């Protein structure tokens, strides 16, 4: 299947003892594999997965250096943003950055990603062409202008199309004990008395990965996309995920209701019904 690598970087400031905390988490196929925390005793990208442990100091050293580098960049962009929004000093602010690349099932590039966020809101992001920007607001305009007159977009275009892809391949080649794998959702429904002559059916999906998944209830072919109960997909804590959907079905008329469970790891969608 397809793959990807992202580096989510956050810099968060608090008042008093200046110097914001810088954090960088990187993922390959949305699985954490490296982490950096300026708050550590000894700041330095740590491996975060058995496989990635086969890298060697030369590497970690080079990465830790880069993280030290980002830290400074954020540290300053943060002082600048502070001025752009005319926010009084002594506050607590956040600068966020998502960067990375996507690969087809063939391993070739498909897209580059580089976007920023200030205070949790979109600030400026590199467009698909990797040549033009998009500034969410007036303050971001200033930033965008500055970044155009310096062709800084080329710099990111180079990394996203190159190093990003070159290393993802490398990573994909090493760690091959879960990355060339996924978990199929096991399913089942549960009966719950709900009211006067009515009940509630709960379509449960458990132990699946990746987290993308879809549940739906049907009453005579038609999908019940109303009065249905969901729940944001959540981590079982072991690496797999869970989610459930439910509906209120007049007692005795259980069988007239079925739920399909759509998920990539699944050969074909699952079909469920209450089993008394």
């Amino acid at each position: 299947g397809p793959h990807s690598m992202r580096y989510f970087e956050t810099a968060v400031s608090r008042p008093g003892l200046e110097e914001p905390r810088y954090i960088s988490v990187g993922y390959v196929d949305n699985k954490e594999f490296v982490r950096f925390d300026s708050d550590a005793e000894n700041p330095r990208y740590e491996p975060r997965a058995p496989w990635m442990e086969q890298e060697g100091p030369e590497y970690w050293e080079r990465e830790t250096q880069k993280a030290k580098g980002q830290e400074q960049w954020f540290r300053v962009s943060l002082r600048n943003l502070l001025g752009y929004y005319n926010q009084s000093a002594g506050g607590s602010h956040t600068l966020q950055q998502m960067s990375g690349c996507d690969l087809g099932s063939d391993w070739r590039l498909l897209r580059g990603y580089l976007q920023f966020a200030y205070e949790g809101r979109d600030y400026i992001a590199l467009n698909e062409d990797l040549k033009t920007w998009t500034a969410a607001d007036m303050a971001a305009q200033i930033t965008r202008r500055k970044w155009e007159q310096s062709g800084a977009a080329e710099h990111y275009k180079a990394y996203l199309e190159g190093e990003c892809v070159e290393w993802l391949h490398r990573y994909l080649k090493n760690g091959n004990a879960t990355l060339l794998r996924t978990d199929s959702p096991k399913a089942h429904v549960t009966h719950h008395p709900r009211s006067k002559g009515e009940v509630t059916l709960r379509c449960w999906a458990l132990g699946f990965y990746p987290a993308d998944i879809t549940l739906t209830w049907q009453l005579n072919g038609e999908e019940l996309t109303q009065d249905m109960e969901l729940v944001e997909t959540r981590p079982a804590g072991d690496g797999t995920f869970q989610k459930w959907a439910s509906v209120v079905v007049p007692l005795g008329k259980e069988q007239n209701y079925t739920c399909r469970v759509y998920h990539e790891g699944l050969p074909e969608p699952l079909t469920l019904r209450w089993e008394p």
Partner: peptide, 10 residues
Amino acid sequence: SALQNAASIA
């Protein structure tokens, strides 16, 4: 490997 931002900052 980590990305390093442009010299151009916010």
